Design an enzyme around this catalytic site. Structure first.
Site, PDB file in Angstrom:
ATOM      1  N   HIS A   1      32.486  90.851   7.519  1.00  0.00           N
ATOM      2  CA  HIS A   1      32.382  92.171   6.704  1.00  0.00           C
ATOM      3  C   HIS A   1      33.199  92.042   5.332  1.00  0.00           C
ATOM      4  O   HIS A   1      33.002  92.704   4.452  1.00  0.00           O
ATOM      5  CB  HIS A   1      32.734  93.449   7.290  1.00  0.00           C
TER       6      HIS A   1
ATOM      7  N   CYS B   1      42.520  94.046   8.817  1.00  0.00           N
ATOM      8  CA  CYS B   1      41.347  93.134   9.251  1.00  0.00           C
ATOM      9  C   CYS B   1      41.450  91.708   9.408  1.00  0.00           C
ATOM     10  O   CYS B   1      42.123  91.321   8.454  1.00  0.00           O
ATOM     11  CB  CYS B   1      39.749  93.415   8.431  1.00  0.00           C
TER      12      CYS B   1
ATOM     13  N   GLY C   1      43.594  96.804   5.301  1.00  0.00           N
ATOM     14  CA  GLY C   1      44.338  95.507   4.920  1.00  0.00           C
ATOM     15  C   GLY C   1      44.638  94.809   6.252  1.00  0.00           C
ATOM     16  O   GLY C   1      44.591  93.445   5.994  1.00  0.00           O
TER      17      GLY C   1
END
Ligand SMILES: O=C(Cn1ccnn1)Nc1ccc(Br)c([N+](=O)[O-])c1
Ligand SMILES: O=C(Cn1ccnn1)Nc1ccc(Br)c([N+](=O)[O-])c1
Lengths: 302, 301
Positions: free
Chosen positions: A41, A145, A143
């Site tokens: 993503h 991920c 932040g």
């Protein structure tokens, strides 16, 4: 003595964490040999995130669209491909700090350590269990991920989790390192929710064994039970079924403490039925289910 | 979202852990630059434990009586001195993995990460608080002595604890890295016991502010309290006194949530009176006191 929620030492993983930027999105990547792993993503903008076609978004990108930063140093991306929900960025330099490692997929009930990271920089380490509903009760902000979960089995790091998203109840969902989600989740902004969770019975029993080993014995009783009878009780209290495999796995703790698993199940029966009557167990007023049998043995022996 | 007892990443400390042996006794040491720090009780025998004279035990040792092992490698000891209750062994190699570091002595209520180690090898990392009675509630077995506690509040490791012993109630006592014990404890096996512990009030308030930041409001009420009346009630539940310093320190959390400190104090009073009536706060059925104001701000926002 003492019993604490304990994470594995995180140094072997710290040396693998990098920053991945694509457009205005920055998140974390895992740098092993000459590949950086991160959530696919990363390639999406907000409009894209509504209904992404990952294959189509990816083919439009060049290697130089991915900025990968290890400490202060830029790594050069020389290839990119997708496997399930993870992006694999081939870089020009093998990570000299690559530990001995494997990718493993864990089962619900199993625990692991999470190294929470922001902008490629490790911030904290904590221990999590994969819940029966395939979420984790983590602590993650924007932040985070691409932060990963792992166990260490010898000198070998087994990577089992990469963080992808937060659900609306404030719990967390992610993939194994081959990019397969845990649980019925997708990497897109649509309506998603955690299913109803259950308590991990075998772990609660493990923790009761930890309590006994540490001198907390008040809940022991003269009674025993059978698997079938106990399972009827577990079901009623939204506990996972206990299997014979679970009984086998607790065997060591049973032998050490003189409390058979079904003897301990009679204790747990009574606790579910009557509560704790204002008492605590290992300093908790609730029954803890995020220690596995292996965790207890490891901390109370190794 | 979420809220977890979170330790600092341990890698900077892992690269400092070594094994120190003297006679039949092995424990852990911390290797920074060219010095290895470890508990001085490593030089004690079975005889020695009740009334050791460390100056007399130490004068009888030569450098080569200390075996220091860093991974596979033996280090050569080229000097030794004692400072309070720590031994400092000067070695022939500076540690190439030495991080930026400092030694800090902490106050009761402060939290830190512990890297539990055996035979110079790290086992696990967890978070601890220095209790009001100067003990810590750790997880330590035989051989864990010389394990350290630390914070890393930028890229700098602040070493604040070195593990020396387990008390009879199963809690833990140790020193700063200058070898001064926390609390009234000594490195002798005479009868000593931890003073009655109390709850760290300022931290509980911090944690209540964390719960509000994370969207939980159920335990608030319409009342306020004076500082003195709060303390009078709190002390009846074995809570530490809250001071004006503590009120000052909670100022930021107060401003972020819109709840005045004394208003939050009134909430805590009511919680102590009522209990939680089957609810939880940040997943706990008890009031948590091992997160500081600083810890809450670090993890939340
Ligand atoms: O959730 C986060 C950020 N965050 C906050 C705490 N932990 N993570 N980003 C995000 C949200 C929804 C979705 Br569907 C996706 N996605 O495309 O998979 C990503
Ligand atoms: O207690 C331990 C071992 N251990 C287990 C877990 N944590 N620590 N060693 C020890 C005990 C009493 C004393 Br007085 C001394 N000493 O002379 O300082 C050392």
């Amino acid at each position: 003595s003492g019993f604490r929620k304990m994470a594995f030492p995180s140094g072997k993983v710290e040396g693998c964490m990098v920053q991945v930027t694509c457009g205005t999105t920055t998140l974390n990547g895992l740098w092993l040999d000459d590949v950086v792993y991160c959530p696919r993503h990363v390639i999406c903008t907000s409009e894209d995130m509504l209904n992404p076609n990952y294959e189509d978004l990816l083919i439009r990108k060049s290697n130089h669209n991915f900025l990968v930063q290890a400490g202060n140093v830029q790594l050069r991306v020389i290839g990119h491909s997708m496997q399930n929900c993870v992006l694999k960025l081939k870089v020009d330099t093998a990570n000299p700090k690559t530990p001995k490692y494997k990718f493993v997929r864990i089962q619900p009930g199993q625990t692991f350590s999470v190294l929470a990271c922001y902008n490629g920089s490790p911030s904290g380490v904590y221990q999590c269990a994969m819940r029966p509903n395939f979420t984790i009760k983590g602590s993650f902000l924007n932040g985070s991920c691409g932060s990963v979960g792992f166990n260490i089995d010898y000198d070998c790091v087994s990577f089992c989790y990469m963080h992808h998203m937060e659900l609306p109840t404030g719990v967390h969902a992610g993939t194994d390192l081959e990019g397969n989600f845990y649980g019925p989740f997708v990497d897109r902004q649509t309506a998603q929710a955690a299913g109803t969770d259950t308590t991990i019975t075998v772990n609660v029993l493990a923790w009761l064994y930890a309590a006994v080993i540490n001198g907390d014995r008040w809940f022991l009783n003269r009674f025993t039970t059978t698997l079938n009878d106990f399972n009827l009780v577990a079901m009623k209290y939204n506990y996972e079924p206990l299997t014979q495999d679970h009984v086998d796995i607790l065997g060591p703790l049973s032998a050490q403490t003189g409390i058979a698993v079904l003897d301990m199940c009679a204790s747990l029966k009574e606790l579910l039925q009557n509560g704790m009557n204002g008492r605590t167990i290992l300093g908790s007023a609730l029954l803890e289910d995020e220690f596995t049998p292996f965790d207890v043995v490891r901390q109370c022996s190794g």
